[PDB]
Amino acid sequence: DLSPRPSPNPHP
């Protein structure tokens, strides 16, 4: 499979 890079911004 394949996973995205971590979000640069914190989650709401």
**Using rule CB under 8 A, residue 10 touches another protein:** no
Q: CB-hemisphere CA count at 13 Å for 8?
A: 0
**Minimum gap (Å) between residue 6 Cβ and another protein:** 10
Query: What is the closest distance, in whole angstroms, from the C-beta atom of residue 5 to another protein in the complex?
Result: 7
Give the whole-angstrom CA distance, residue 4 versus residue 8: 12
Residues near another protein (CB under 8 A), total: 8
Binding positions for another protein, rule: CB under 8 A: 1-5, 7-9
